[PDB]
Amino acid sequence: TNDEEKLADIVENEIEKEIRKYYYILRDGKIYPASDYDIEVEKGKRSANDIYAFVETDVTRDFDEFLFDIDYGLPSISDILKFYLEKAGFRIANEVPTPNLKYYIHAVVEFGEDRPQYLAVNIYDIDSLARALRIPQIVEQKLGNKPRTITADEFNDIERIVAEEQPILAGYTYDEALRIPYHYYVDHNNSFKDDALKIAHAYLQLFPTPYQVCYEWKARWFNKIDCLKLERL
């Protein structure tokens, strides 16, 4: 929890810095835009082994979408699978592995006009997330326990099972589980209530609850705020 609080302030300080004018957080706490860092790795300047946390920032202007991204803003299946496989020792084709990645961070910023209103930082433990998605079992069944370089075809075959085949939430495949609550919460379509609540109930029980830190934009800076106060708005 102390590491997670430190990580949320690192993200908040960076979003704030970016406002007034994708990321990796290294094991030393330094934050860099991921695109640039990937080029520095490709040059041999920086090491992919130093990446501790991956940050995905989403920006919104609709409050319902903001709350929905906070509550359902899980990392991409491709990302969790890639992060799991690499953390387990497997290598995906010619791609540079990130074996020491512990956290996936989803930061959501809500805007007023051209100026911001809120920031919500969600910190997920990658291992916990991979387990809830049944990724270890599926990888073991398909590839075995001994790590090696896998083909893009093998990665895709695993990805398909995890996201589009297995009923993971209230009998729905993962992709269906993403769509239905969007239709209810963001599209404000009431006929989707029953199914969204069923998915919500399963998701809140089965999926790991993230370390959540919230902030309000007040006079050119972010100020800490209670997340439970936020959900009421």
Author numbering: 25 to 45, 58 to 269
Structure paper excerpt:
Acidianus two-tailed virus (ATV) infects crenarchaea of the genus Acidianus living in terrestrial thermal springs at extremely high temperatures and low pH. ATV is a member of the Bicaudaviridae virus family and undergoes extra-cellular development of two tails, a process that is unique in the viral world. ATV is the fourth most abundant of these proteins. Remarkably, ATV displays a new protein fold, consistent with the absence of homologues of this protein in public sequence databases.
Two crystal forms of recombinant ATV were obtained belonging to the tetragonal space group but with different cell parameters. Crystals of the first form diffracted to 3.85 Å resolution and included one monomer in the asymmetric unit. The monomer A from this model was then used to solve the structure of the first crystal form by molecular replacement. Refinement against these data produced a new model, at 3.85 Å, with R and R factors of 27.1% and 29.5%, respectively. Remarkably, these interfaces are not conserved in the first crystal form, which actually displays less extensive contact surfaces, the largest masking 608 Å2 per monomer, none of them considered as significant by the PISA algorithm.
